[PDB]
């Protein structure tokens, strides 16, 4: 993943 989405 990205990790950009907001990292939950």
């Known amino acids: 993943?990205?990790?950009n989405?907001?990292?939950g």
């Open 5 to 7: 989405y907001i990292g």
């Open 1 to 3: 993943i990205n990790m």
